[PDB]
Design an enzyme around this catalytic site. Structure first.
Site, short mmCIF file in Angstrom:
data_model
loop_
_atom_site.label_atom_id
_atom_site.label_comp_id
_atom_site.label_asym_id
_atom_site.label_seq_id
_atom_site.Cartn_x
_atom_site.Cartn_y
_atom_site.Cartn_z
N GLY A 276 -8.83 20.29 19.04
CA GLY A 276 -8.33 21.63 18.83
C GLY A 276 -8.96 22.61 19.82
N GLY A 277 -9.22 23.82 19.35
CA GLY A 277 -9.84 24.86 20.15
C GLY A 277 -11.37 24.80 20.32
N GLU B 202 1.02 -1.39 8.82
CA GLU B 202 0.11 -0.28 9.15
C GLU B 202 0.03 0.05 10.62
OE1 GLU B 202 -1.85 1.93 7.25
OE2 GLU B 202 -1.99 2.78 9.29
N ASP C 163 0.40 3.47 6.06
CA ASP C 163 0.61 2.99 4.73
C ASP C 163 0.37 4.10 3.70
OD1 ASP C 163 1.24 0.54 5.87
OD2 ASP C 163 -0.34 -0.62 4.88
N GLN D 175 0.80 -1.25 0.00
CA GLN D 175 0.00 0.00 0.00
C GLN D 175 0.84 1.30 0.00
OE1 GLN D 175 -3.44 2.44 2.44
NE2 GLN D 175 -3.01 0.30 3.08
#
Lengths: 415, 415
Positions: free
Chosen positions: B247-248, B139, B168, B16
Site C-alpha cells: 500500500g502507501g 486451492e 477455498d 473446504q
C-alpha cells in the site's frame, strides 16, 4: 430491486478494509454516505497517483458508487449533522483507532439512544482483549499476526506476505458477512447491534487448515504430505511448504516456456491421487503407471520433486496456456499463473463482470474488480467514485438544511 | 435468537470452499443438513487423519454444528427424499462439477417450480464463460489463475502460493456474502435465486490492489514504492515484491532473536511516513530525523533496505514479542510473525473466541477457528462435527418417513 434497496450507510472508513466492505454495500443497493475530512479526504485519493492532481486508482477502485460528503465532526455544527445522519442510518462503519467515535460525542450507548435500529460495524487490528490491542495494523502486520506469513513462503526463506489483501479487503469481506447477518438478525429482534471484526482474525480464518496441520503435527511429529516428509525435519510449528498443495492433493509451480525472461511463464500443476495413470500418459511415462515406487501418493512423496522435475521437462517446451489446454484433457488440475496484465485484458473476465471498465470524471475509463459473486435476480451497476465533497449539499438538503445554511457551513469550515 | 433461526440449508458440499460457507451458516443459527454419500462421506473425513479410524481434523474443523445424512440421490428413493428436502429448504449449496444437480434430476428450472423461495448457491473453479470452465480447480490452481501467485513471492524467485486459503475458504466466505444478500433480497421479491461464486474471482477480489498497480504500471512504466524502484527494472506486469507493504506505507519482515533456528523469530515492521522522527528515536538514530537523505519516503526508497538492515540490528537482539512491545510505544506499526503453535496456545485468542476448544465424540478435545466476527447481541455456540449419517434417521423422520421405511431404505442402500 436490489438486496439492500433502502438501506442507508454512514461510512467513515478509509483506505482498504472498511472501504471494500462499503463499496459492496453500495453495489448491493445501499446508499453509502462516505464521511470525509474537509479539504483532505480519504488518504487513498492522493496516494499512488498515476495521473497528476486527480483521485488515484487506489481511491476509485474502492469507492465506486458512494456519495462523498465533507464534514468536520470536531465542530459543533458537524456534530449536529452527524447526530442527524446516525438517526436516519441503518449502518455505521468505521475503521478508526479505539475510542474515535466515543470522542466525537457518540459512544455506542449514545448511538443506541439515538437509533436502536442502527448496526455499528467496527474494523480493528486485534480483538478487544488482545496484548496487541494498540498496535496500529496495516495489511502485512495482520498477515504476520494471523498465521499467514509464518506458513507462506519456503522452508529455507523468511516468512512471506501474500499479495492477496488478507488483512485489508479480506477483513472488509468478513465485516460485510457480519453486517448482512446483523440485518437479518434485526428483522427478528427489531434492534441493531455492534459487529466487530479484527484483521488478525480475518487472516486466521483463511488459515484454518494450517491450524489443522498444527494439531496433526503436535500429535504425530510429522506431516506426511509436506515437502519435509520424510527426508527433512519438522520443528514444533507448521513449517513453510513452498508451492505445495496445502490439502490432500500435492502440487507445485512449474516453469513453462519463456520463464527466463517472463516471471509469469508458469503453471500450477496438481498430481491428483485418482489421476495418476492419466498423468503418466500426459507426460509419456507408461512405466510409472504400475511401478510401486510411483503408483500411490505414499510412494511418490519421498521423490515427488524428481517427479515434478520430470513433468517440468514437458512444461518448459510450451507456453503456459498451451500446457494447460493439453494437460487439462488428461483431467490434470492445472492453470496458468496469470499476470495482472493478462487479467486486466482477459476478454472472458470482462464478459463475466469480474473486471469492469468504469467511466470516471476527469480520468476517463478505469478498470476495477467487479462484484465477485453473480446473482440470477440482480445485476450490479458499477459506477464512478465520488469526487471529494461531490454530494455534501445533496446530503445536507436531505437532512433538511437550507441552501443558505449549507453555504454558511462551507464558509465556517464545518464542511 | 440467532441471525438465521429457522433457515434450513441443504448442503451437498465437501472439502473446504463449500463447507466453510455452510459451517458459518450453522454458526449463525441455520439448520445445515449435510448430504453425504452412504458408506463414504465427505473425503475430508478420511484425509490427513492424526488419530486412526476416526474423522480427521480436516473434517471436524469445517463441519461443526452440521447434521449428517447419508443419501444416494442416484436411486429412486434417494431422489424422492431429495425432492422433499428441496421443498422444505431455504438454501441449497453445492460445489460439484457443472451439471451434477441437473444430472440428479433437478435443473434450476425444476427447483424453482418445486420451491420458488429456494436460494441455490454454487461454487465453481471459474466463471461460466471462461475458457477454463471445466478445469478442476484446487486451492492453488485458483491462486495461479486469480493473480495471487503471480504477485506473491520474490522478484527473483517463482510465483508463490499463499498458505491462506484464497481459493477455498475465501471462496466460501464470498459465497456466504451472496447467500446472505440473497436472503435479504428474498424479503422483498418473495423469491429465491441462484448465486454463483468462482474461485478465480475470489482470489482476484483480494488482489484488487494489484490491478491498481497494473494500471499504474501501464501508465507510468514504474511503481515508485516497489522494491524495484529506482535501481531495478519493471516489465509489463506487476512484479513480485517480497515482503513490501503493498500500500502507501513500506515495510518488511525483520529478524528477531532466535531466527537462525526458529523460522518464525521475525516481525513485520512498517516505516510509516508520518512517524519517521519516532522511528529514528526507537532505533537511536537521531541524526536521521532531519537528514534530507532520510526524512521523506521518497528519499528513503532508493536505500530502504539499508534502513531495514539498520533496524534489524536492534530487532535481532530481542525476542519478537519484546521488539513489538517496545516499538509500538514509538508508534511503529509492527507485529510478531506468530506461528500456528503460538496461535494454537495463545490465551487471548481463546478468550476472544478466535480459537475454540470443542468436544468431539471419540476424539475428545480439538481446536478450531471460531466465528471470525463478534456480535454484541449474539454469541455462537460451536459444537462437534457430525459422525457420518448420525442424523439420517432424524432428518427422514422430520420429512414424514416411518422407522420401517427408514430401515428399509438402509437395507436398499438408498441411505
Amino acid at each position: 430491486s436490489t438486496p439492500l434497496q433502502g438501506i442507508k450507510v454512514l461510512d467513515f472508513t478509509g483506505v482498504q478494509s472498511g472501504p471494500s466492505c462499503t463499496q459492496m454495500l453500495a453495489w448491493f443497493g445501499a446508499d453509502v454516505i462516505k464521511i470525509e475530512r474537509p479539504g483532505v479526504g480519504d488518504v487513498t485519493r492522493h496516494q499512488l497517483r498515476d495521473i497528476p492532481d486527480i483521485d488515484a486508482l487506489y481511491f476509485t477502485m474502492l469507492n465506486s458508487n458512494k456519495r462523498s460528503i465533507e464534514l468536520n465532526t470536531k465542530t459543533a455544527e458537524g456534530k449536529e449533522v452527524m447526530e442527524k445522519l446516525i438517526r436516519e442510518a441503518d449502518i455505521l462503519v468505521e475503521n478508526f483507532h479505539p475510542g474515535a467515535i466515543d470522542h466525537m460525542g457518540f459512544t455506542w450507548e449514545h448511538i443506541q439512544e439515538i437509533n436502536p435500529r442502527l448496526i455499528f460495524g467496527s474494523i480493528k487490528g486485534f480483538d478487544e482483549c488482545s496484548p496487541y490491542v494498540n498496535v496500529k495494523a496495516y495489511e502485512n502486520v495482520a498477515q504476520a499476526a494471523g498465521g499467514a506469513a509464518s506458513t507462506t513462503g519456503f522452508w529455507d526463506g523468511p516468512p512471506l506476505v501474500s499479495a492477496a489483501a488478507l488483512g485489508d479487503s479480506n477483513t472488509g469481506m468478513h465485516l460485510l458477512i457480519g453486517l448482512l447477518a446483523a440485518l437479518l438478525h434485526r428483522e427478528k429482534t427489531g434492534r441493531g447491534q455492534r459487529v466487530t471484526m479484527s484483521m488478525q482474525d480475518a487472516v486466521l480464518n483463511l488459515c484454518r487448515v494450517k491450524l489443522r496441520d498444527q494439531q496433526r503435527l503436535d500429535k504425530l511429529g510429522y506431516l506426511e504430505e509436506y515437502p519435509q516428509y520424510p527426508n527433512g525435519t519438522f520443528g514444533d510449528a507448521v513449517p513453510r511448504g513452498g508451492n505445495a498443495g496445502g490439502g490432500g492433493q500435492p502440487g507445485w509451480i512449474l516453469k513453462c516456456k519463456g520463464w527466463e525472461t517472463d516471471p509469469n511463464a508458469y503453471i500450477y500443476f496438481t498430481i491428483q491421487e485418482q489421476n495418476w495413470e492419466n498423468t503418466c500418459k500426459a507426460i509419456g511415462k507408461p512405466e510409472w503407471i504400475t511401478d510401486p515406487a510411483y503408483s500411490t501418493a505414499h510412494a511418490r512423496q519421498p521423490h515427488i520433486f524428481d517427479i515434478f522435475a520430470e513433468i517440468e521437462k514437458y512444461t518448459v517446451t510450451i507456453d503456459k496456456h498451451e500446457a494447460v489446454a493439453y494437460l487439462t484433457q488428461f483431467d490434470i488440475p492445472c492453470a496458468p499463473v496469470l499476470s495482472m496484465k493478462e487479467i486486466s485484458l482477459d476478454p472472458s473476465l470482462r464478459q463475466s463482470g469480474s473486471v469492469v471498465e468504469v467511466e470516471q470524471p476527469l480520468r476517463g475509463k478505469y478498470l476495477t474488480v467487479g462484484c465477485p459473486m453473480k446473482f440470477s435476480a440482480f445485476t450490479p451497476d458499477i459506477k464512478a467514485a465520488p469526487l471529494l465533497g461531490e454530494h455534501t449539499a445533496a446530503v445536507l438538503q436531505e437532512l433538511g438544511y437550507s441552501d443558505d445554511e449549507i453555504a454558511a457551513m462551507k464558509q465556517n469550515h464545518a464542511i
